[PDB]
């Protein structure tokens, strides 16, 4: 039934707030929380992400968390901001100084129990808790440290529930913080063991999209978050809207995740639009199909043609022909047959939603479990290794009480994940 | 020749040729009832053997109707018992799965405490 | 002087119905028992305080049907409820059933009606047993009764009236078993048995009476005539065969060979136009032709050992010997060495009585012959072969053994029937 | 006096048809009241019908079924009113074409209940002859329960005789696969318990209807019509006063030379079609050869394959007894290879001046032929096909049975064929 | 008397039950309130003191949705609220949840209601279980229930209606796992199972009803006709014939060999025009066309062990026999040497009835051919191979194991299937 949301850190809260702007609009809710939309479907599954409040108002089941008041203030002073329950804003003033150990161990831990009290409150309000969803940065402190800390601490209390994340991968193309690969690597390990599914939002892809495609010379975060949000409404459509399913996180997980350690998804979207720009002419069903399955439309900088799809789930939005859809969908896999594992029969599922997003007469979301994701992990390991080899910036970590072993362990666990991805990539049915 | 004369009757011999030869020749109730009883003993005993085989058939009928009853109960026992072991081994299995995954987390929870401890030592 | 007519089985009963029907006619008795206006008739009838003369007869049958038909007919008054004994279930064409099974059951009670019939006797001459040959009732029980009659009333004569089985007539497949089995038991106990081959009677009712398909009633019309022509001199004041012990002498030289051949004349029909009524010479010549023989066998190829010529009605002794004198002139008619070549003629002056409104016709003159011939074994060979085929393959035997009998008896019966067959060989030299 | 039991769908339909044909032939209307012409009818009425005073005539019929279906057909049927309401003995769990169900599990739960009724009906008899079972050998009730009733009765009335009307299963009429399993189990019981068994063959009843009666789509009505005809014809000497004047035990003693060899080949002449059309009389020789010919035997055997141990034949109506006798002797002379020499005068005739319903001249054959082993070889083969592979046995082992009980029933029936064999090869 | 209880597990089972029970009302002039203006239908509907005719049915599901659509549906009054059972959390397309984890929490409440329907049975014939092969509820819960009823009701007749998974008709990646585990667990507890290949019901709706993309309603309606046609011999009593349980004796030679193949005919579009009508010989021959098979298989290439024809409408023995003859000549109907070649026939008075505003046209006369062919074993092999592909690499296996299952429960289940496959080889041997 219902989902509890947690946004952590700067990026976490940044992409989180926008998800709430996107989906509240999609559900016919104004910044106060009063429903003022046409369709009865916008409410049919509204309880998934919202709480029914007094005065017939709706309030997001979301917990705002950070170690700096900064972004939480940006959010509050922001558009919907007054929409969230202000008790859920679990904030500290310390800061995490882009240090995993300040988040996971030192500073983070002091706030962690105050956060859990609020998550336990939202879990009690629930009729049937489905699982949890975290939006977080993997290169910072709060998102990477306190994020993974919360995942683990929640996991202790709700081992029965689905732990799903929107993890945003750091690229040097977007951020100068040298220690980001350290923080990335440490967080990936926590994910590989504590999350049922993770959507890999990679700032390398995000930047390259806004630049090479949307031709914005100096892309801001607002420009990148626009893609994150477009994707998020997409990846959560069947979760929110009534269709030909049913509508569950566990159901998605059981089908999309064949091997437990391998729950890292490559999101992708079609069409790619500029932040707040009016759409002119809509795309045909083949255009949507072709685009969606293209490297240039992927939310993670990995070439799907360099690996193999274990599982694929594709969600089409807007009023279109399912026979056209079913024709197109089967063409793709019949021509790209080599990029789909033969040992997972009928691994490409398709959901169609008659409700399109704002300003798009037709959308298409892609969720793939391609072995190609190793490319991203490798990219991080190389980035980590370079610095680790020289024991670079380590006293920022050892100064928080950490160990050089914890670091070597983390590298090793990353390396194993890549080898695991490669094994099934190379695996043949004969 | 003559034999006799009577009221409403008469009789007389009539020889046609003499006989060539002058010479001529050339019970117990105790034992009937002994033999009558004998036949009755036999008839009564073969009927008693017929009775033996007929009652031996009644036994067979009792055996099969019982086999059918026992076959159903052994079936219900096996079904009930297999399910008992199935539902238990399951509970047993799943429980250790969760108890171990909580230990793995509690072990990681141990680690965090020592990091906070290692930072204090460093001051 | 008294005489008990025992009627065992369906034949012996229906046969006993026909005879006492004829006696009541010949003596002038009503079906109520009373008679209006020569004492010798009383050798067969016991009078009551009501002047009614009740027959000295006991009817035995193991099924109610037949005897219940007596208690229905006009002659229902003639007999007492005690003298018409009926069981529940008959021997069902089974000798062994009639003897050992349903026999034992009814024996004692059957002897009681005889006892009480004999407890009313000055001195019983003997008993006249009527029955079939191949009936389960008219074989098994008859033989059982003869066993006890020979004990309980020993030394008193026994005159058997047997009905020899025939295919042309309502015969059953098991009859040859019953026939030999009964003869084996009723051999030592009979003193003189008069066989009646149903086949012979069948032809007689055809060729002469002109009845293609004769009823049992029509066949019994002649059986009563002949049986009455046999008993004639006992019921009346005659000279030839004045007692039962006379036949045992007059016809039975060798004791086992006690089966004389009967013969009757004239066989006459009423639904045919009037003509010159037959002479003594007419009916005496006829008496020798096997066309009127009571039993089917070749007398021409059989060595004789006795002869009688029992006449009735309007006869003259000269005219009688006038026919004897004419037959020895043409035919030889062989005889055994140890036996004298000649008859024992007797005339019972009483007239030939025929049923008023019956198949038979009113005749002034009538004759019957009693002739013991080795030729009678030609019918025992018929029976002995039929027995030998079935018994060879044990066909039907199980039924007899099922009633308590033994295969031990099946052979005992045939071995004795082969010994009796040799007695006709030892004699017919 | 005879007690009549009808078991199963087949047995109750067969039985209902006997009881209506004979009701007409005895002048008893569907209410139970005498309206007949001659008093010759009521003379031997005490064999099948009882009194109520009344005068009301109730048939000495006991109705048994493991489901109500058939019982209600009778109840709702025309002559169905005539039956004692207190004589309908039925369950609700149909045994469903399973001998082991009808014979053990289901049947046993209704046997004692039926027996009480026979006990009652036999007490009201001065002297009883025996029993009359009408049933199918391929079903469950007639096949299994009917054989169970025979066994139980044999224990209560050993001395009383067991007469049955046993209809033989054929793949022509009825598609149930298991029929051979039932019949072989049924036959095994009849070999040991009955005294006389009238082997009515559905193979033959169908072929007669089809090839000869020219019925393109033969129905059970048409099949049963021939059976009702033959049942009245084989009971002519029992329920009718003529020169014969006989019964059940006498019939068995004379028909059955050896114990086990008690399965008869019923016959009939002329082969009448339902209702349509009658017209034109038959000559005596036309009647004789018809009846003695295979195209008339209610059993699927060629009589020219074996040898008749004993033959019985009841002729009906006004005919020349001469003509009848004349043709029979001619037949035995011509086909003397097919009659046993070692059982003399083994062919037995009977005549009855009252002609049957509609047709004014009938002939009803009853042969105890060694040829009957052909009906058994057939049954045994169909059994063996399935049995060698142990097919459909689960349905039987589920009811408590063992594979041994099947192994024996076949063995015992094969031994019966080897028994009929001995006398087919035997001479004098 | 002769009572029959229908149990409907999961989404497929329930939705079919609705198609079934709707038609049943129409079939028996019954109104959706329970009232109605041959007493043989009482075997399926119990009657009350008020005169309402309540079905002898139990609707079960681990999640509420599907059942709630009936509790609010046009037939909210047709059933008892007690007899429509629901859980809160579903089986997440996982047998192990349906069976153990989640089913354990409902089973006793389910069995208790079956007991209360069992009481209203003067003489119960047995149970009819409608379920999917691939649902977590359809697989797990059904097998638990079957096992449980085999203790509760011992050897009492248990029949099945199982929806065989097809790619075109939804399906999920784990469905082979679900279908193989369920076959194995139910195999003993089942006395007879009627397989329904969703592809075939898809193909028929496409090729005959001319529906380009058929709905669940469309399929379920077609299915209901076939199912009703099979059960006609129990809700009706005609002199003509009508006789299940008998078919069942011929159909099942051995206990494991209890899977008949339905070959329903005629399927005619409700907009066919001149159409009226088809002879018995048309409809009989139709049964031998693979295009009409309930399961996609090749019995022209497989030996026969049984053949049953179930006519309904305006059928007369003349043409039936005349038809049977025309077929019985042709050499493609090859039976084995161990069982006869006769075709068991059954005939109804009540013609097939049509649904208000239906996809199908109204036929004067319809037939359903149940047969025991070694060609049904292909459906097993088809499924087994798909299972074999994933199991080889133990794909998705962890979701099962995580719920308390053992790897062996998959070996055992597969070995049993290979035995069932070997057993169908062995049986066709002459
Ligand atoms: C080969 C034997 C079969 C089974 C018969 C017969 C059944 C019958 O007679 N039946 C089936 C119910 C009853 C009966 C029939 O049809 C209403 C009526 C008129 C009847 O004869 N009723 C009796 C009473 C009765 C009721 C129930 C049972 C028996 C008798 C009467 O009124 O006198 O159908 C004509 N038949 C040729 C058939 O055509 C059947 N075909 C088959 O069984 C085949 C495929 C030929 N078997 C290899 C089928 C297509 C109906
Ligand atoms: N001449 C003649 N022979 C008869 C008569 N009744 C039967 N028979 C013959 O007797 C033989 C059969 O014996 P039955 O006396 O009829 O039968 P039963 O066993 O003695 O007596 P039941 O058991 O009552 O039939 C056959 O050869 C019949 O032809 C009859 O009245 N006259
Ligand atoms: N023919 C048909 N197939 C269906 C229907 N509903 C689901 N399916 C099939 O059922 C399978 C999935 O199983 P479900 O019954 O939906 O799932 P469930 O676990 O039993 O039930 P839920 O927990 O409600 O999802 C797939 O193979 C579908 O094709 C239906 O109404 N008709
Ligand atoms: C109750 O009905 C009958 C009863 C019997 C017989 C019979 O067939 C004519 C019947 O009619 C069917 C009978 C049968 C066979 C015989 O031999 C084959 C025999 O010798 C003798 C007979 C019967 N006796 C006579 C003289 O026919 C006695 C038993
Ligand atoms: N797309 C996106 N990336 C962001 C945003 N804010 C920070 N980042 C990325 O997040 C990483 C650092 O995490 P950050 O959120 O600053 O640290 P935290 O506040 O301590 O969790 C870098 O790689 C940045 O690229 C944002 O709003 N959007
Ligand atoms: N001749 C005939 N055979 C029938 C009749 N009814 C059923 N049968 C046959 O009986 C056999 C099966 O027995 P059945 O009467 O159905 O079963 P039961 O009720 O369990 O005894 C098959 O060979 C059917 O052809 C009927 O009335 N007449
Ligand atoms: Mg007798
Ligand atoms: Mg499910």
The CATH number for D321's domain is 3.30.1330.20
The CATH number for D10's domain is 3.40.50.1440
Neighbours of E39 (CB within 10 A): 8
| Residue E15 marked as a ligand binder | yes
- Same domain, residue pair D20 and D120: yes
User: Could you give all domains of chain E from N- to C-terminal order, each with its CATH number?
Assistant: 1-260 (3.40.50.1440), 261-375 (3.30.1330.20), 376-430 (1.10.287.600)
C-alpha distance from residue C319 to each of C143, C281, C323, C324, C347 (Å): 43, 7, 7, 9, 12
- Same domain, residue pair A330 and A397: no
In order, the DSSP letters of E350-413 are SPPPPPTT-SB---S-EEEEEEEEGGGHHHHHHHHHHHHHHHHTTTTHHHHHTTT--THHHHHH
Residue closest to D351 by CA, chosen among D247, D230, D243, D205: D243
Find all residues with CB under 8 Å of D95, minimum gap 6, and list them: D66, D67, D101, D102, D106, D107, D139, D140, D141, D144, D145
Chains B and C touch (3+ CB pairs under 8 A): yes
Task: Tell which atom from ligand 4 comes closest to the C-alpha of D237.
Answer: 2
Write out chain A residues lying below 8 Å of B103, CB-based.
none
- Same domain, residue pair A133 and A223: yes
Ion ligand 8 residues within 5 Å by Cβ: E 90-91, 135-137
Report d(CA D235, CA D367) in Å as an integer: 15
Does ligand 3 have an atom closer than 6 angstroms to the CB of E10? yes
E396 at the A interface (CB within 8 A)?
yes
Residue closest to D301 by CA, chosen among D364, D347, D222, D368: D368
- Same domain, residue pair A194 and A302: no
* Binary contact (E154, B75; C-beta < 8 A): yes
- From A357, A372, A387, give the residue that closes a domain: A372
- Same domain, residue pair A389 and A324: no
Token output for A316: 């089409």
Q: For residue D212, which phi and psi values (nearest 5 degrees)?
A: -105, -50
Q: What is the SS3 assignment for D210-246?
A: HHHCCCCCCCHHHHHHHHHHHHHHHCHHHHCCCCCCC
Does ligand 1 have an atom closer than 6 angstroms to the CB of E341? no
Q: What is the SS3 assignment for D150-212?
A: HHHHHHHCCCCEEEEEEEECCCCCCCCCCHHHHHHHHHHHHHHHCCEEEEEEHHHHHHHHHHH
Q: According to the entry, how was the structure determined? A: X-ray
Of A323, A343, A345, the CB nearest to E213: A323
Q: Using the mean position of ligand 8's atoms as its centre, give its distance from the Cα of residue D421 in Å.
A: 68
User: Could you give all domains of chain B from N- to C-terminal order, each with its CATH number?
Assistant: 27-123 (6.10.280.30)
- Same domain, residue pair D304 and D362: yes
State which residues form the domain around D93.
1-257
Q: Which residue has the tokens 């329950």?
A: A85
- Enumerate the active-site residues of C: 246
Neighbours of D213 (CB within 10 A): 18
- Same domain, residue pair A28 and A137: yes
- Same domain, residue pair A313 and A173: no
Residue closest to C99 by CA, chosen among C416, C423, C422, C404: C404
Token output for E288: 């031998």
Q: Using the mean position of ligand 4's atoms as its centre, give its distance from the Cα of residue D244 in Å.
A: 8
Find all residues with CB under 8 Å of C69, minimum gap 6, and list them: none
Establish how many alpha carbons lie within 13 A of residue D77's alpha carbon, considering only the half-sphere containing its beta carbon: 18
Interface test with A, best of B111, B112, B114 (most A CBs within 10 A): B112
Q: Pick the catalytic residue: E105, E246, E415, E425?
A: E246
Are A25 and A358 a contacting pair, CB within 8 Å? Answer: yes
Ligand 4 atom 18: residue of nearest CA:
D310
Task: Tell which atom from ligand 2 comes closest to the C-alpha of D246.
Answer: 25
Does ligand 2 have an atom closer than 6 angstroms to the CB of C63? yes
Which residue ranges have their beta carbon within 6 Å of ligand 4?
A: C 170-173; D 237-238, 244, 246-247, 250-251, 254-255, 310-312, 314, 346, 348, 350, 366
Does the active-site annotation cover E246? yes
* Binary contact (A156, B122; C-beta < 8 A): no
- From D323, D344, D371, give the residue that closes a domain: D371
E398 at the A interface (CB within 8 A)?
yes
Q: How many angstroms is the resolution?
A: 3.2
Task: Tell which atom from ligand 2 comes closest to the C-alpha of D245.
Answer: 25
Are C293 and C253 a contacting pair, CB within 8 Å? Answer: no
Does ligand 2 have an atom closer than 6 angstroms to the CB of C230? no
* Binary contact (C239, B20; C-beta < 8 A): no
Ligand 2 atom 27: residue of nearest CA:
C165
Report d(CA C263, CA C278) in Å as an integer: 17
Going E35 to E37 to E39 to E44, the CA torsion angle's sign is negative
Give the relative orientation of helices C175-185 and C377-392 as an angle to the nearest 10 degrees.
120
Q: Which residue has the tokens 């011929």?
A: E250
Query: Which ligand minimizes its atom distance to the CA of E217?
Result: 3
The annotation places the binding site of A for Mg(2+) at 66, 68
**Sequence-separated contacts (24+) of C106-112 with Cβ below 8 Å:** C106/C60, C106/C62, C106/C141, C107/C144, C107/C145, C107/C148, C109/C85, C110/C58, C110/C60, C110/C85, C110/C141, C110/C145, C111/C145, C111/C148, C111/C149, C111/C152
* Binary contact (B43, C233; C-beta < 8 A): no
Neighbors of chain B by Cβ distance (3+ pairs < 8 Å): A, C, D, E
Report d(CA D282, CA D362) in Å as an integer: 9
B97 at the E interface (CB within 8 A)?
yes
Q: A195 to chain B nearest CA, in Å?
A: 13
Report d(CA A10, CA A23) in Å as an integer: 20
| Residue E237 marked as a ligand binder | no
Going A71 to A77 to A78 to A83, the CA torsion angle's sign is positive
- Same domain, residue pair D144 and D210: yes
Neighbours of A345 (CB within 10 A): 20
Q: B4 to chain C nearest CA, in Å?
A: 6
C-alpha distance from residue C300 to each of C285, C307, C344 (Å): 14, 15, 20
CB burial of residue B34 (10 Å; 0-12, 13-18, 19+): exposed
Q: Which of A16, A71, A98, A140 to mutate to test the pocket of ligand 5 (most atoms within 8 A of CB)?
A: A140
- Same domain, residue pair A238 and A283: no
Ligand 6 atom 14: residue of nearest CA:
D139
Taking the CA atoms of residue D47, residue D53, residue D57 and residue D59 in that order, the dihedral angle to the nearest 10 degrees is -70
Angle at A108 between CA A103 and CA A111, to 5 degrees: 160
Going A271 to A274 to A277 to A281, the CA torsion angle's sign is negative
Report d(CA E184, CA E35) in Å as an integer: 41
User: At E430, is the secondary structure helix, strand, or coil?
Assistant: coil
Of E249, E338, E339, the CB nearest to D395: E249
Taking the CA atoms of residue A241, residue A245, residue A251 and residue A253 in that order, the dihedral angle to the nearest 10 degrees is -50
Strand partners, A90: A65
Report d(CA A42, CA A25) in Å as an integer: 10
Are E313 and E351 a contacting pair, CB within 8 Å? Answer: yes
Find all residues with CB under 8 Å of C92, minimum gap 6, and list them: C136, D247, D249, D250, D253
Core vs surface per residue C269-295: b (16+ CB within 10 A) or e: eeeeeeeeebebbbbbbbbbeeebbbb
Query: In chain D, how many domains are there?
Result: 3
- From D326, D347, D371, give the residue that closes a domain: D371
Of E174, E213, E386, the CB nearest to A322: E213
Query: Which ligand minimizes its atom distance to the CA of E13?
Result: 3
Q: What is the SS3 assignment for chain D?
A: CEEEEEEHHHHHHHHHHHHHHHHHHCCECCCCCECCCCCHHHHCCCCCEECCCCCCCEECEEEEECCCHHHHHHHHCCHHHHCCHHHEEECCCCCCCCHHHHHHHHHHHHHHHHHHHHHHHHHCCCCCCEEEEEEECCCCHHHHHHHHHHHHHHHHCCCCEEEEEEEECCCCCCCCCCHHHHHHHHHHHHHHHCCEEEEEEHHHHHHHHHHHCCCCCCCHHHHHHHHHHHHHHHCHHHHCCCCCCCCHHHHHHHHCCCCCCCEEEECCECCCCCCCCCCCCCCHHHHHHHHHCHHHCCCCCCHHHCCEEEEEEEEECCCCHHHHHHHHHHHHHHCHHHECCCCCCCEEEEEECCCCCCCCCCEEEEEEEHHHHHHHHHHHHHHHHHHCCCCCCHHHHCCCCCHHHHHHHHHHHHHHHHHHHHHHHCCC
- Same domain, residue pair A13 and A23: yes
* Binary contact (D175, E342; C-beta < 8 A): yes
Are D354 and D40 a contacting pair, CB within 8 Å? Answer: yes
The CATH number for D383's domain is 1.10.287.600
Query: Which ligand minimizes its atom distance to the CA of A174?
Result: 5
Report d(CA A310, CA E88) in Å as an integer: 31
- Same domain, residue pair D367 and D381: no
């Amino acid at each position: 039934r219902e989902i509890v949301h947690i946004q952590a850190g700067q990026c976490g809260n940044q992409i989180g707030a926008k998800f709430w702007e996107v989906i509240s609009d999609e559900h016919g809710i104004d910044p106060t929380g009063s429903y003022h939309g046409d369709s009865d479907l916008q409410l049919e599954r509204i309880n998934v992400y919202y709480n029914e409040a007094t005065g017939n108002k709706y309030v997001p089941r979301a917990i705002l968390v950070d170690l700096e008041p900064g972004t939480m203030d940006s959010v509050r002073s922001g558009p919907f901001g007054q929409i969230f329950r202000p008790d859920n804003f679990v904030f500290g003033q310390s800061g995490a100084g882009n240090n995993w150990a300040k988040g996971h161990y030192t500073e983070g831990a002091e706030l962690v129990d105050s956060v859990l009290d609020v998550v336990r409150k939202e879990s009690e309000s629930c009729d049937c808790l489905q699982g949890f969803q975290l939006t977080h940065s993997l290169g910072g402190g709060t998102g990477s440290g306190m994020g993974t800390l919360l995942i683990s601490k929640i996991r202790e209390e709700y081992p029965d529930r689905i732990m799903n994340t929107f993890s945003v991968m750091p690229s040097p193309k977007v951020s100068d913080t040298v220690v980001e690969p350290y923080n990335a690597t440490l967080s990936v390990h926590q994910l590989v063991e504590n999350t049922d599914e993770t959507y890999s939002i990679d700032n390398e892809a995000l930047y390259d999209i806004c630049f090479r495609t949307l031709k914005l010379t100096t892309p801001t975060y607002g420009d990148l978050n626009h893609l994150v949000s477009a994707t998020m409404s997409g990846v959560t459509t069947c979760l929110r809207f009534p269709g030909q399913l049913n509508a569950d996180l566990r159901k998605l997980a059981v089908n999309m995740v064949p091997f437990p350690r391998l729950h890292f998804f490559m999101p992708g979207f079609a069409p790619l639009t500029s932040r707040g720009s009016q759409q002119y002419r809509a795309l045909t069903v083949p255009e949507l199909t072709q685009q969606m399955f293209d490297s240039k439309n992927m939310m993670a900088a990995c070439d799907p043609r360099h690996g193999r799809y274990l599982t694929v789930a594709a969600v089409f939005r807007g009023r279109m022909s399912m026979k056209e859809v079913d024709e197109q969908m089967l063409n793709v896999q019949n021509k790209n047959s080599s990029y789909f594992v033969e040992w997972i029969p009928n691994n490409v599922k398709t959901a169609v939603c008659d409700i399109p997003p704002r300003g798009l007469k037709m959308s298409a979301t892609f969720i793939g479990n391609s072995t190609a994701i190793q490319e991203l992990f490798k990219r991080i390991s190389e980035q980590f290794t370079a610095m680790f080899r020289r024991k670079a910036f380590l006293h920022w970590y050892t100064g928080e009480g950490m160990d050089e072993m914890e670091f070597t362990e983390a590298e090793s666990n990353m390396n194993d994940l890549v080898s695991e991805y490669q094994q099934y990539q190379d695996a043949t049915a004969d | 020749i003559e034999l006799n004369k009577a009221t409403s009757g008469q009789s007389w011999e009539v020889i046609l040729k003499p006989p060539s030869f002058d010479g001529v020749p050339e019970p117990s109730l105790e034992e009937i009832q002994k033999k009558l009883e004998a036949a009755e003993e036999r008839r009564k005993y073969q009927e008693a053997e017929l009775l033996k085989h007929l009652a031996e058939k009644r036994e067979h009928e009792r055996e099969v109707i019982q086999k059918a009853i026992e076959e159903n109960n052994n079936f219900i026992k096996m079904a009930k018992e297999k399910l008992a072991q199935k539902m238990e081994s399951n509970k047993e299995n799943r429980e250790a799965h969760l108890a171990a995954m909580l230990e793995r987390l509690q072990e990681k929870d141990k680690h965090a405490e020592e990091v906070r401890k290692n930072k204090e030592l460093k001051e | 002087r008294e005489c008990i007519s025992i009627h065992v089985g369906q034949a012996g009963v229906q046969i006993g119905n026909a005879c006492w029907e004829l006696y009541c006619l010949e003596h002038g008795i009503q079906p109520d028992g009373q008679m209006p206006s020569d004492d010798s008739f009383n050798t067969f009838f016991s009078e009551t305080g009501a002047g009614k003369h009740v027959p000295r007869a006991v009817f035995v049958d193991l099924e109610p049907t037949v005897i219940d038909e007596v208690r229905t007919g006009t002659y229902r008054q003639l007999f007492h409820p005690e003298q018409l004994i009926t069981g529940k279930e008959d021997a069902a064409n089974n000798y062994a059933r009639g003897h050992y099974t349903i026999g034992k059951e009814i024996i004692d009670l059957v002897l009681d009606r005889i006892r009480k019939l004999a407890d009313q006797c000055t001195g019983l001459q003997g008993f006249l047993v009527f029955h079939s040959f191949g009936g389960g009732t008219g074989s098994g029980f008859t033989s059982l009764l003869m066993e006890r009659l020979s004990v309980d009333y020993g030394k008193k004569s026994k005159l058997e009236f047997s009905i020899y089985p025939a295919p042309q007539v309502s015969t059953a497949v098991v009859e040859p078993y019953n026939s030999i089995l009964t003869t084996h038991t009723t051999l030592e106990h009979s003193d003189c048995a008069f066989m009646v081959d149903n086949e012979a009677i069948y032809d007689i009712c055809r060729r002469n009476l002109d009845i293609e398909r004769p009823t049992y009633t029509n066949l019994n019309r002649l059986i009563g005539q002949i049986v009455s022509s046999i008993t004639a001199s006992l019921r009346f004041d005659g000279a030839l065969n004045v007692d039962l012990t006379e036949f045992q002498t007059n016809l039975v030289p060798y004791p086992r060979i006690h089966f004389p051949l009967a013969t009757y004349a004239p066989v006459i029909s009423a639904e045919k136009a009037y003509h010159e009524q037959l002479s003594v010479a007419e009916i005496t010549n006829a008496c020798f032709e096997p066309a009127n023989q009571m039993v089917k066998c070749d007398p021409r190829h059989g060595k004789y050992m006795a002869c009688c010529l029992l006449y009735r009605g309007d006869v003259v002794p000269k005219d009688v010997n006038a026919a004897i004198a004419t037959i020895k002139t043409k035919r030889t008619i062989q005889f055994v060495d140890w036996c004298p070549t000649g008859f024992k003629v007797g005339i019972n002056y009483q007239p030939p009585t025929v049923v008023p409104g019956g198949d038979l016709a009113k005749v002034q003159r009538a004759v019957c012959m009693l002739s013991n011939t080795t030729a009678i074994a030609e019918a025992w060979a018929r029976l002995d072969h039929k027995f030998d085929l079935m018994y060879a393959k044990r066909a039907f035997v199980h039924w007899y053994v099922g009633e308590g009998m033994e295969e031990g008896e099946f052979s005992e019966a045939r071995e004795d029937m082969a010994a009796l067959e040799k007695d006709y060989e030892e004699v017919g030299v």
